[PDB]
């Protein structure tokens, strides 16, 4: 092979096979008895036992592995579980000391990028998703309503991107360092904000929030011409959200609340 | 053979689509670490979706509007007036 993305010993191969296919008794036996087993050994694609177990929705194997203090790729495991919508595995990973005993979930993408702890790295070089994608942003992207609610209860929020013409020091430093990365990070944040799951679970008035967000995304589509299609897609997402909310009205009172914004101005 | 050729084009487009920062884009578009050798090769080989991808387009715009930071954000009328005064 041209690229070596990872030689594993027989014991390590057995452990990785057991974790990948949910051989819970074997995994437990190796964790309890093997003193020469590297719990962080990786497969041909650089995925350790935790990543393999999470990817295959092996909750019991994940729980067994989480009892190892030196277990690695905890943050990437949470991101993978969130992306696949494995709620119980997300609960188990969120009980890890790396999340419960820290403010990791309440860190903005800029704040989480401020320190180079490589907590969410899925290997020795880079992360599974974009570094600016937080667990709450990823949950919004994948429309995982239960995961979004869980992260909201923990204090996670999606920070609103600054204006495209904002002159603050952070925006100028990001534009002068990597304009493409700045644009991609803004798109990812707006994709999280435009998500119906985040819109419905984070805003006290989701209809008004989605209407304003749709207008802002349309304006950004006009401005950022290269990524126009992405911004139009997000704007259509917001419009679809408000249309669905109106579609679910049953009596006149709900219709008046949606159309007027409070309890015949027709402001909305 | 056309199906296989489209498969190769889809592969390079997907690889470019997965770029996250400027360094990865430069590696894909230039072939090493602004010659744009791979962009020129894609044009020669008619890999349209590779050069039309927004990841390649933004770098092309950066080279296109070099030393004109601010003129890029202006409207079409401003650019037309610029052409007129240049003439």
């Amino acid at each position: 092979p041209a690229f070596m993305f990872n030689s594993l010993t027989a014991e390590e191969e057995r452990f990785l096979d057991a974790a990948e296919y949910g051989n819970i008794p074997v995994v437990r036996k190796m964790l309890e008895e093997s003193k020469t087993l590297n719990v962080n050994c990786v497969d041909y694609m650089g995925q350790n036992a935790l990543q393999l177990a999470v990817g295959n929705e092996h909750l019991e194997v994940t729980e067994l592995l989480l009892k190892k203090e030196n277990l690695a790729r905890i943050g990437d495991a949470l991101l993978l579980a969130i992306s696949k919508g494995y709620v119980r595995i997300v609960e188990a990973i969120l009980n890890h000391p790396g999340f419960a005993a820290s403010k990791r979930l309440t860190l903005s993408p800029c704040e989480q990028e401020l320190q180079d702890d490589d907590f969410y790295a899925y290997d020795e070089d880079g992360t599974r998703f974009s570094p600016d994608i937080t667990p709450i942003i990823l949950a919004a992207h994948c429309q995982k309503y239960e995961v979004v609610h869980m992260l909201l209860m923990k204090g996670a929020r999606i920070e609103r991107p600054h204006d495209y013409f904002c002159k603050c020091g952070d925006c100028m430093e990001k534009q002068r360092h990597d304009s493409f990365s700045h644009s991609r990070s803004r798109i990812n944040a707006y994709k999280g904000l435009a998500s119906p799951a985040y819109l419905s679970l984070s805003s006290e008035d989701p209809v008004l929030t989605a209407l304003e967000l749709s207008n802002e995304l349309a304006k950004l589509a006009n401005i950022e011409k290269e990524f126009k299609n992405d911004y139009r897609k997000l704007s259509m997402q917001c419009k679809d959200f408000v249309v669905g909310v109106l579609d679910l009205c049953r009596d006149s009172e709900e219709v008046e609340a949606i159309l007027n914004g409070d309890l015949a101005s027709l402001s909305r | 053979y056309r199906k296989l050729s489209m498969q190769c084009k889809d592969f390079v487009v997907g690889v470019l689509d997965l770029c996250r920062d400027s360094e990865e884009v430069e590696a894909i578009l230039n072939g090493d670490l602004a010659s744009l050798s791979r962009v020129k090769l894609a044009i020669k080989y008619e890999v349209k979706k590779f050069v039309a991808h927004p990841n390649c387009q933004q770098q092309l715009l950066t080279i296109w509007y070099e030393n004109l930071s601010g003129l890029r954000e202006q409207t079409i009328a401003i650019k037309c007036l610029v052409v007129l005064v240049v003439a």
């Binding site: 993305f5 290997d123 070089d125 880079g126 599974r128 | 690889v15 997965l18 590696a27 894909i28």
Partner: peptide, 29 residues
């Protein structure tokens, strides 16, 4: 040993392989 271009290409190809597997899992059953 490996150049910066080689490391970037390795990272991008690994990302492509994982992305391709994810999209394969998105195909209809």
């Amino acid at each position: 040993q490996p150049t910066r271009y080689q490391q970037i290409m390795k990272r991008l190809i690994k990302r492509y392989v994982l992305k391709a597997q994810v999209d394969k899992e998105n195909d209809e059953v």
